[PDB]
Amino acid sequence: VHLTPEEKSAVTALWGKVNVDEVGGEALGRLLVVYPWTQRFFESFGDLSTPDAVMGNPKVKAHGKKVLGAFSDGLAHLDNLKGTFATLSELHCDKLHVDPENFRLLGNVLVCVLAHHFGKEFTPPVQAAYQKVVAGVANALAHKYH
Amino acid sequence: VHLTPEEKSAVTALWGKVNVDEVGGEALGRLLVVYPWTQRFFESFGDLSTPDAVMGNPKVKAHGKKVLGAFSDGLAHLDNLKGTFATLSELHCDKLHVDPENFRLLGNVLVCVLAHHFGKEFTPPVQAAYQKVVAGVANALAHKYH
Amino acid sequence: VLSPADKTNVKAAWGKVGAHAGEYGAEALERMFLSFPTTKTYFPHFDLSHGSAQVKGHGKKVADALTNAVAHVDDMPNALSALSDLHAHKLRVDPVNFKLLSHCLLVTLAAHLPAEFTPAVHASLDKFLASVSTVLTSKYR
Amino acid sequence: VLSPADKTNVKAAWGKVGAHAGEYGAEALERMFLSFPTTKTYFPHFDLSHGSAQVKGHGKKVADALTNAVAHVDDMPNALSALSDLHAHKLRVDPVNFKLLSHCLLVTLAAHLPAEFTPAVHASLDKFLASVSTVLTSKYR
Numbered sequence: 001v002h003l004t005p006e007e008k009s010a011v012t013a014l015w016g017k018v019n020v021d022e023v024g025g026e027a028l029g030r031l032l033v034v035y036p037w038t039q040r041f042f043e044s045f046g047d048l049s050t051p052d053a054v055m056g057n058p059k060v061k062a063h064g065k066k067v068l069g070a071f072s073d074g075l076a077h078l079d080n081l082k083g084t085f086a087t088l089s090e091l092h093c094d095k096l097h098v099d100p101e102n103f104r105l106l107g108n109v110l111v112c113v114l115a116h117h118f119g120k121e122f123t124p125p126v127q128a129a130y131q132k133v134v135a136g137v138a139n140a141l142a143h144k145y146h
Numbered sequence: 147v148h149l150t151p152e153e154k155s156a157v158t159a160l161w162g163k164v165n166v167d168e169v170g171g172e173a174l175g176r177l178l179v180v181y182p183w184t185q186r187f188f189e190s191f192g193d194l195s196t197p198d199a200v201m202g203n204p205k206v207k208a209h210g211k212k213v214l215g216a217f218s219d220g221l222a223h224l225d226n227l228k229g230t231f232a233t234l235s236e237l238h239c240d241k242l243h244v245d246p247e248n249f250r251l252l253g254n255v256l257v258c259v260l261a262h263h264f265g266k267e268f269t270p271p272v273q274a275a276y277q278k279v280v281a282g283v284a285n286a287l288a289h290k291y292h
Numbered sequence: 293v294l295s296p297a298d299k300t301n302v303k304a305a306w307g308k309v310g311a312h313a314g315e316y317g318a319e320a321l322e323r324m325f326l327s328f329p330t331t332k333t334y335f336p337h338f339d340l341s342h343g344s345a346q347v348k349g350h351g352k353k354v355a356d357a358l359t360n361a362v363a364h365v366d367d368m369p370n371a372l373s374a375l376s377d378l379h380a381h382k383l384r385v386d387p388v389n390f391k392l393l394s395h396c397l398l399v400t401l402a403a404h405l406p407a408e409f410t411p412a413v414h415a416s417l418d419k420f421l422a423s424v425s426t427v428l429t430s431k432y433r
Numbered sequence: 434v435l436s437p438a439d440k441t442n443v444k445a446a447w448g449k450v451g452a453h454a455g456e457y458g459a460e461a462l463e464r465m466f467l468s469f470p471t472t473k474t475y476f477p478h479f480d481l482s483h484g485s486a487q488v489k490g491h492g493k494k495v496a497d498a499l500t501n502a503v504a505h506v507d508d509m510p511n512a513l514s515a516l517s518d519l520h521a522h523k524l525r526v527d528p529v530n531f532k533l534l535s536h537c538l539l540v541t542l543a544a545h546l547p548a549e550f551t552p553a554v555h556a557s558l559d560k561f562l563a564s565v566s567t568v569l570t571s572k573y574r
C-alpha cells in the first residue's frame with residue numbers, strides 16, 4: 001500500500017454501500033465459471049457444471065462471505081496488508097498450493113463485480129485505486145512462495 | 147529467501163565457476179531474441195534485428211556484465227534481496243516502467259544459460275534452488291508497483 | 293475453443309452495446325491508462341488526459357477492430373492481420389498488456405451493461421478477447 | 434506465427450535429441466516437480482521421487498506427444514486433441530503450468546544439447562512449445 005488520502009476515500013466509500021454476503025459470492029461464483037481449473041479445489045463442493053448451479057450453490061455463496069470477509073480486514077489494515085494475511089497465505093500456499101496468479105484473477109473478477117453493481121459510479125480513478133488494494137491483497141497471500 | 151544450508155551451497159558453487167562477463171550477456175542477448183518487446187527498451191542500442199547482431203553487440207555484452215553484476219550482489223546478500231535493490235527497482239519501475247514479468251523471463255532465461263553452460267552438473271535440485279534465488283531477485287526489483 | 297454458443301453471447305452482448313462501442317473503447321483506454329500506469333509508455337503522444345480527444349478518437353479505433361472480430365470471428369487470423377503485425381512487428385507491445393485492456397474492456401461492458409452481463413456471458417466475452425489477443429500476439433509465438 | 438524456418442529449427446533440434454526423447458521428457462518432469470512444487474498437486478499417485486518409474490514412464494508419454502506435434506506441426510489442433518480435452522476437460526490444469534514445463538523442457542534441451550542450442554533455436558523451441566500449450570489450453574479459451 002499507499003492509497004493517497006484521495007484514493008483511500010473513493011475506496012472506503014463504495015464498500016459500505018457493499019452488500020458483502022451477496023457480492024462475496026457473485027465473485028467466487030464467477031471465478032469457477034470464467035476460470036475453471038479453480039474448480040479442482042472446490043469438489044468438497046457440489047454440482048459446479050453449468051453456470052446456474054454455481055451461482056446458487058448455497059455452498060459457493062457461503063465461502064464467498066468468508067472472502068469479502070478478508071478484503072474487509074484488508075480494505076483497512078492496509079498497513080501490513082502483509083500480516084493480516086500470514087495464516088491464510090500459509091493456508092493458500094503450502095496447504096492447497098494455489099498458484100499465485102489465481103490470486104489476481106480473483107481480485108480482478110471481484111472488480112468486474114464491484115463495477116457490475118455500482119455502474120457509472122465506479123468511475124475509473126475509482127477502479128484504479130481498487131487494482132491497487134487488490135494487487136496488494138494478492139502480493140500478501142502469495143508471500144510464502146519465497 | 148531461505149536457501150537451506152544445502153541449496154545455499156550448490157548455488158554458491160556453480161557461480162564462481164561462472165564467467166560473468168560472458169554469461170552476463172549470452173543472457174541479455176537471448177532475451178531480446180526470444181522475447182522481442184524487450185527490444186523497445188534498448189534502441190539507445192544498435193542493430194538488434196537478426197540474432198547474430200545482438201549476441202555480438204559489444205553494447206549488449208557490456209550492459210549484461212552490469213547485470214550478472216547484481217545477481218552477484220544478490221546471490222549473497224540473500225537477506226534483504228529486498229534492499230540491495232531499492233534503487234534499481236526505483237530505476238526499472240517508475241523510470242522505464244518495465245512490467246514485472248519481464249523480470250521473470252530474464253532470470254528464467256538466465257537459468258537456461260546457466261544450464262547451457264554447465265550441462266549435466268546443473269542437476270535438478272541444483273536448478274530448483276536457482277528458480278528460488280531468481281524468483282527472489284524478481285520479487286525484489288518489482289517491490290515498487292505497490 | 294470458441295464454441296457454437298460463445299459465438300452467440302458475443303454476437304449478442306456486442307448486439308446491444310452498439311451506437312456506443314466508441315464511447316466504450318475509450319472509457320477502457322482511460323481505465324487501463326489510470327490503473328496500470330505502465331502502459332502509458334506507448335502513447336507518449338497522447339494527453340492520456342480525461343477529455344483528451346486522442347483517447348476519445350482511439351476508442352473509436354479499438355472499438356472498430358473489436359467489431360470486425362465479432363464479425364469474422366470464425367476466422368480472426370485473417371481479418372485482424374495488420375493489427376497483428378503493427379502491434380507485434382512495428383510497435384512491440386509486451387503481450388501481458390493485452391490481458392489488461394482485455395480486463396478494463398470487461399469492467400466496462402460490466403459497468404454500462406448489467407442485465408445482459410450474466411456470468412455465462414462474462415465468460416464468453418472473456419473467451420472472445422483471450423482470442424483477439426492470441427491473434428494480436430502471433431508473429432510473436 | 435510459427436514460420437517456414439522455426440518449423441525447421443524444431444524438426445532439427447528434435448532430429449538430434451532422438452533415441453533420448455524419453456529420458457529427457459522425464460528429466461523435465463523431475464525439474465518442474467522440484468522447482469515449482471505447486472505442480473505436485475496433480476501427480477498425487479506418483480513417487481515424484483527421483484528414480485521413480487512412474488515419472489520415468491511418463492517422460493516417455495510427454496515425449497511421445499511432443500513428437501507427434503513436431504510431426505504434424507502445420508496442424509497441432511487436430512493431432513493433439515485428446516490431450517487437449519484430457520488436460521482441459523478431465524483434469525483442469527491451471528494453464529500457467531504449461532509455461533513452466535515449457536521452461537524445464539528447455540532447460541533440458543539446453544543441458545543435454547549445447548551446439549545445436551543456438552539462440553535462434555532457443556527461440557524456435559520456445560515458439561514451438563508456446564504453441565503446444567495454446568493447443569493444450571483451448572477448450573479453455
Ligand code: HEM
Pocket residue numbers: 038039041042066067069070071088092096098102103106107137138141
Ligand atoms: C483475495 C484472494 C483470496 C482470499 C482473500 C481468500 C480467502 C480465503 C479464506 C478466508 C478462506 C477460509 C479461511 C478460513 O475459513 O479459515 C479460504 C479458503 C479457500 N480458498 Fe481462498 N482466498 C482467496 C483466493 C483463492 C484462490 C485464487 C483460490 C483458488 C482456487 C482459493 C481457494 C480456496 C480453497 C480451496 C479454500 C478452502 C479452504 C480449505 O479447504 O482449507 N482461494 N480462502
Ligand code: HEM
Pocket residue numbers: 184185187188212213215216217234238242244248249252253283284287
Ligand atoms: C534480474 C533482473 C534485472 C536486473 C538485475 C537488472 C539490472 C540492471 C542494471 C544494474 C542496470 C544498470 C543500472 C546502472 O548502471 O546504474 C539496468 C539497466 C537497464 N535495464 Fe535492467 N535489470 C533486470 C531486468 C531488466 C528487464 C526485464 C528489462 C526489460 C527490458 C530491463 C531493462 C533495462 C534497461 C532499458 C536499462 C537501461 C538503464 C537506463 O537507461 O536507465 N532490465 N538493469
Ligand code: HEM
Pocket residue numbers: 331334335353354357358375379383385389390393394424425428
Ligand atoms: C483488444 C486489443 C487491441 C485491439 C483490438 C487494438 C487495436 C488497435 C488498432 C485498430 C489500432 C490502429 C489501427 C490502424 O491505425 O491501422 C491500434 C493502435 C495502437 N495500439 Fe492497439 N489494440 C489493442 C490492444 C493494445 C494494447 C494492449 C496496447 C498497449 C500498448 C496497444 C497499443 C497501441 C498503440 C501504441 C497504437 C498506435 C497508437 C498511435 O500511434 O497512434 N493496443 N490498436
Ligand code: HEM
Pocket residue numbers: 472475476494495498499516520524526530531534535565566569
Ligand atoms: C508439453 C506440454 C504437455 C504435454 C505435451 C503433455 C502430454 C500428456 C500426455 C500425452 C499424457 C497422457 C496421454 C494419455 O494417456 O492419453 C498426459 C497426462 C497427464 N498430464 Fe500432461 N502434458 C503436458 C503438460 C502438463 C502439465 C503442465 C501438467 C500439470 C499438471 C500435466 C499434467 C498431466 C497429468 C496429471 C496427467 C495424467 C497423469 C496420470 O494420471 O496418469 N501435463 N500429459
